[PDB]
Symmetry: C2
Subunit: 803 residues, 2 copies
């Protein structure tokens, strides 16, 4: 593939030399005992050496130039593997391929050794990872700041058809990409109390946890820019027990909480949040110092990814008032201009509302600062809406009830000059529902920043053949300017391009089928429509609606066995938060459907249903490029944006989905006729809520649906334990918040239209080309350019740094 | 100094290149932000690269040659710093000095950054470290095996005159010398139960702890041999708590137990012991396999450093019988021929006697194997001494009482073909008292291996000037053949040599005084006799007898202020085990004596008493070369050998001590007239024990002693808390096991003779030369050659490996 670059003779010679050098001196191995793992490590170290000069030069350039610095604070960075990504952005892929081939090795085999850096749960974590890449590609002096969890998202095993969790020991064989920086270790304080003297308040008698930073390089695409991701690791500041007890402090960075769109008020999580925020803000203040605080917002932007790091607002006030001696007003003007907040969901149980008692014990000074912030904000509300007493109760940072709580989203809005949603429909709903009172007070604060994905990882890395047939016609500029994909609409009637698109897809399906056979020993039919739903397991995403369709296909086949149907391989994958019973029961239903469907001789290879184990970033890179049909079927109004939808669109799959999140903009970009939109719109969901959702009405009017519920309830998909899915049935019939049954009919009819088009490969491929060609808006470069110009106040750039 | 080698032009050029390369690529630093710490690390990495080829070649040579392999099992390796040692043994010291000087840096300043690898308590730990060095210098295929504690011996701080302990975070900035080997991680089992089937016993339902090895290179002196030290680190094999609970398994290698000559039956310690033994023996069996077991003792020697790893005996039987299917008898013949045990003390509270209940819970199969071992050994005792029923009770591996226990020393003797003491007087006492019943049963098993110290670390590294004036007269061969020091008796009347010895000592005293002023801000008089007692704090070592002398000097000065006395700086240092009350009270007495003595204007600079903080291997390298008088005053019969005594002797100090441990052999080597021997001999200690030690008789007959006890009891050395030393006084007067008062008179008189000779510098220096010259026997090369030929069955060699 030409998009993989040049294999220069001197460069290849040097790479082999450095490979062998690292094998010897760094690994203390030799070719008689080296394993594939040893060879992956020698290549990783060789490749990492190419980033070092660039990394030092970039950081020096930012110091000499003094641009405004962007601090992206997130509790999650779902980075995935780094070896291939580094090669792609430095243009070393073909050279390393050749160098390793000349040494008798297979570079793709080596790449499979690397563990995903799985420091995220799903969407929000991966968005942060795409954003880091785009900010480096756009020449921004941007710093990703988070926590170096020892254990990322658990490794999911399927045992007896059920999810089992295993600790993800991602650091076992080391992380060659990071650089430990113990010399820059800082102190983070907890508990203690406030003394109010004549020098104001003083936070004393605290317990200290040290924050040790680990820096990882983040290379831009061919611009020689190398930015930094700084991740903090927790360290302790009779005798035997006192040494063993150091683990209590070190437990702060031990493991990522594995929830997705769900708030659990755990004190340990609150410590993780504050730990990231306190250490990051000391870095920020020190770098700034190296007259002053007036210009702080001109040199600093702090971006809050969700409310997770919202303690930065009170922490910045604490530092500016208590330690730097600024008056409250000047400090508050600074804080608001520095900070901006990104909201990721309207689902109520996702919102962070910490008990005030907890904040009072753990962070007494922050709680004091929060109450003063609230009092002053509520005084502005009263002056703007005099006599509107309910508004004050609704807008307050303090929530009433048996347990008083602090609404972290309300703190974020009060302390930020910009608040944004992650898709047009979501940003509008914030202004019209959830944050309507805030929007009326300060209309100008409310923005939209439709999410995006990086086309480096999500096209060049994961689908080289696709990237190559595109580059054959329009060159390589589209890799860092994805709106150039629009040029591909010129080839909708081009017989060579139609042939190559379909061939690339078939090669990817063969590559995916080989991976499943080899690694999980699962056999799938390559000449079947690959129907894929990969994302976290949650009732709102409606994996259960997919299950109803799948069973509908099986039941229709059994009713009329001689009738031809487009062969399908239905694949569903994703993790369930440990402790989310319904999510865990859904995984077991998927595997149980497959237990019946996949062994029925009448069905044979016409229909197969498989649960894809351990869905994670590296699996996404394998399965998405192989998919024919992309399932994005959340109840309208529930998926804020989605980003997996975008990946599928860029990789040649057609989409079946509701008008929700960024699906609406994707369908707008491609033309609605080039998408498979079905189901209730947000207005219909609301009308049902207004009159009351009665699932029984659907069961009574739909014979096919009725048949499926009776099989589930009667034990057809669980012969040895007939009442096993009694809980799934109960929720669907009586407490279904996401209205699965209401979209059943239209979803099945829509799926029939999907099959009808798939029977005409030429026309399926032509509609694919119209999707790939209009996928340009969904690049994270576009998104990041919008944050930079509309929020951060910095101009993005593609100009290269000296080679 | 010529003993530091050549600074070749190409070598210096290469070293600078590699320094700068590591600074850039390994450290990701540059000269504008680099600190001394960064420069130490770049030099450490540069130096480590020189060991790598040698290390790979040595291990390959052992594989090709197939010599018998020596496994040295120890719970402690007190290695100290490694940078200077590596340079010395590879002949790179002058070249690196020049290379760093040419880069504008001071190499000795860089060396001070390195943390001691303090994985030992004192003598036994450091012996293991000297032994590793000597085994590499003697070309033996020797493997040091132990545990990689995260925290070594605590860092001692002195606060208000008392010891405070701080965790020794020796790995904070990393360990550049070790190589993690996670690929060779092995499983260690605990608890569970035994199933007795038809395939014999089966240890099932166990809990697993993983043992991850870290390999460190151990370079021989200029022979290009690089051996390995393998240290095991412990790793774990609702959801959140299960991940946080991984620390319970990882706590096994967290911290070294800080006891010295004291047994505490802690279950965690028992796990540490078994963890080292089980993982090491799997390595041993695997390497052996790569007909067979008959030759196992011809290819394997397992050396047990104390009874700490004595579980290797039952573990080897367990593996050979239960897993390899050997019959008990063949397995037991193998085990006895493989294993040998070194005893380090006769002090009763040092002996390991584990509760059988504990062994039964934790290691059920080992306990079963132990009882069968005992039954068979006791059958041999009965057949050899028919009707001697008390002998059976005394020799048994099982000790009776409220809590039945397993005597680990009895297991070691029963399962070893050789048992040795660590000094001639100690090995004889084993045969005559403690192990007399065992000696009568198997006389041939009992040996002596007088301890030694490596003259690389303890002469070339720590006293380059001394090593140089010696090499000026007899060349460099003595560095790996210390008996050549005997050639120095030719210079006892040589005016140039007498001058240079005394000048080297004065330079070392000035260097030590500068270190104390700079680092601890303590001022000492350089023209004072440096009287030093450095070793762990324990009643048997009699720091308290030194305290009585010191107070005697002060009281004599005050009685006759105009009388001239040889000026002295009395320095005492050493750690107290946390929890040993008397040891901790002794440290506070030393500091309290200094509080009065050091501020008395009548005394002025004629007498100074200082407590040296944080005595450790790197401090030993600084203070020992500066000492004039070496205090080795343990009650006769209590110090098995000692090794600090040897260090002092090699470095130009004269010794004041009892006829105990290796002091007897040192005095024998130098001629008793060249030593300051005083006090009770072992026979006198016994006669006192026979009639009963009455400390009151000494108090009543000695007016000067009486004066000191009355000052202590009355509060003279603790004005603000007059009864503070009431406990020290009580023990001395009524429960003194070590009879301090009995040696008081002779010790003071002996000290007067020390002063009388010090007033004649020419004659002091001549007696020093007679000590240095006869210090050759105490090289650890001699000791290791004796283990190799008399126990291991391997011939030591100085032949070089290819350059």
């Amino acid at each position: 593939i030409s998009v993989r670059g040049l294999a220069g003779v001197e460069n290849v010679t040097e790479l082999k030399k450095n490979f062998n050098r690292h094998l010897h001196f760094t690994l203390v191995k030799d070719r008689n005992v080296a394993t594939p793992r040893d060879y992956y490590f020698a290549l990783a170290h060789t490749v990492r050496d190419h980033l070092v000069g660039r990394w030092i030069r970039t950081q020096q350039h930012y110091y000499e130039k003094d641009p405004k610095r962007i601090y992206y604070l997130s509790l999650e960075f779902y980075m995935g593997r780094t070896l291939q990504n580094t090669m792609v952005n430095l243009a070393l892929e073909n050279a390393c391929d050749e160098a390793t081939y000349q040494l008798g090795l297979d570079m793709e085999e080596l790449e499979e050794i690397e563990e995903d850096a799985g420091l995220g749960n799903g969407g929000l974590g991966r968005l942060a990872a795409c954003f880091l890449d785009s900010m480096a590609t756009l020449g921004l002096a941007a710093y990703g700041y988070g926590i170096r969890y020892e254990f990322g998202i658990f490794n999911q095993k399927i045992c007896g058809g059920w999810q089992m969790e295993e600790a993800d020991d991602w650091l076992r064989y080391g992380n060659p990409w990071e650089k430990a920086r113990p010399e820059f270790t800082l102190p983070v304080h907890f508990y203690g109390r406030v003394e109010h003297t004549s020098q104001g308040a003083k936070w004393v008698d605290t317990q200290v946890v040290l924050a040790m930073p680990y820096d990882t390089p983040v290379p831009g695409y061919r611009n020689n820019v190398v930015n930094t991701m700084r991740l903090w690791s927790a360290k302790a500041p009779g005798y035997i027990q006192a040494v063993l007890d150091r683990n209590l402090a070190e437990n702060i960075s031990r493991v990522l909480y594995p929830n997705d769109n769900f708030f659990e008020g755990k004190e340990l999580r609150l410590k993780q949040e504050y730990f990231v925020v306190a250490a990051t803000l000391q870095d920020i203040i020190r770098r700034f110092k190296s007259t002053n605080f007036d210009a702080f917002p001109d040199k600093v932007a702090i971006q809050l990814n969700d409310t997770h790091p919202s303690l930065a607002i009170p922490e910045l006030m604490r530092v500016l008032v208590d330690l730097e001696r600024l008056d409250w007003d000047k400090a508050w003007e600074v804080t608001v201009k520095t900070c901006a907040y990104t909201n990721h969901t309207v689902i109520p149980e996702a919102l962070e509302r910490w008990p005030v008692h907890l904040l009072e014990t753990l962070l007494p000074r922050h709680l004091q600062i929060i109450y003063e912030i609230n009092q002053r904000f509520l005084n502005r509300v009263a002056a703007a809406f005099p006599g509107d007493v309910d508004r004050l109760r609704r807008m307050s940072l303090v929530e009433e009830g048996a347990v008083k709580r602090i609404n972290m989203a309300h703190l974020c809005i009060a302390g930020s000059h910009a608040v944004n949603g992650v898709a047009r429909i979501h940003s509008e709903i914030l202004k019209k529902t959830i944050f309507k009172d805030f929007y009326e007070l300060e209309p100008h604060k409310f923005q939209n920043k439709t999410n995006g994905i990086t086309p480096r990882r999500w096209l060049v890395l994961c689908n080289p053949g696709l990237a190559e047939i595109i580059a054959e016609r329009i060159g390589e500029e589209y890799i860092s300017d994805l709106d150039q994909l629009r040029k591909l609409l010129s080839y909708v009637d081009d017989e060579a391009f139609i042939r190559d698109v379909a061939k690339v897809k078939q090669e990817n399906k063969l590559k995916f089928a080989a991976y499943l056979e080899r690694e999980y020993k699962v056999h799938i039919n390559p000449n079947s429509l690959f129907d894929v739903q990969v994302k976290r397991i949650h009732e709102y995403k409606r994996q259960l609606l997919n299950c109803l369709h799948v069973i509908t296909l099986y039941n229709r086949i059994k009713k009329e066995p001689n009738k031809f149907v487009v062969p399908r391989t239905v694949m569903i994958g994703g993790k369930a938060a440990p402790g989310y019973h319904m999510a865990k029961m859904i995984i077991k239903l998927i595997t149980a459907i497959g237990d019946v469907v996949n062994h029925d001789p009448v069905v044979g290879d016409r229909l197969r249903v498989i649960f894809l184990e351990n869905y994670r970033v590296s699996l996404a890179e394998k399965v998405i490029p192989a998919a024919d049909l992309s399932e994005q079927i959340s109840t309208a109004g529930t998926e804020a944006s989605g980003t997996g939808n975008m990946k599928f669109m860029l990789n040649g799959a057609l989409t079946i989905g509701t008008m929700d999140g960024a699906n609406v903009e994707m369908a707008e970009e491609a033309g609605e006729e080039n998408f498979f939109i079905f189901g209730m719109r947000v207005e219909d969901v609301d009308r049902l809520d207004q009159r009351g959702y009665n699932a029984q009405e659907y069961y009574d009017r739909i014979p096919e649906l009725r048949q499926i519920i009776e099989q589930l309830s009667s034990g057809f998909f669980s012969p040895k334990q007939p009442d096993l899915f009694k809980d799934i049935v109960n929720m669907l019939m009586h407490h279904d918040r996401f209205k699965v049954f209401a979209d059943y009919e239209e979803y099945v009819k829509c799926q029939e239209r999907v099959s009808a088009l798939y029977k005409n490969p030429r026309e399926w491929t032509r509609m694919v080309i119209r999707n790939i060609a209009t996928s340009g808006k969904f690049s994270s470069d576009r998104t990041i350019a919008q944050y930079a110009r509309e929020i951060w106040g910095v101009e993005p750039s593609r100009q290269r740094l000296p080679a």
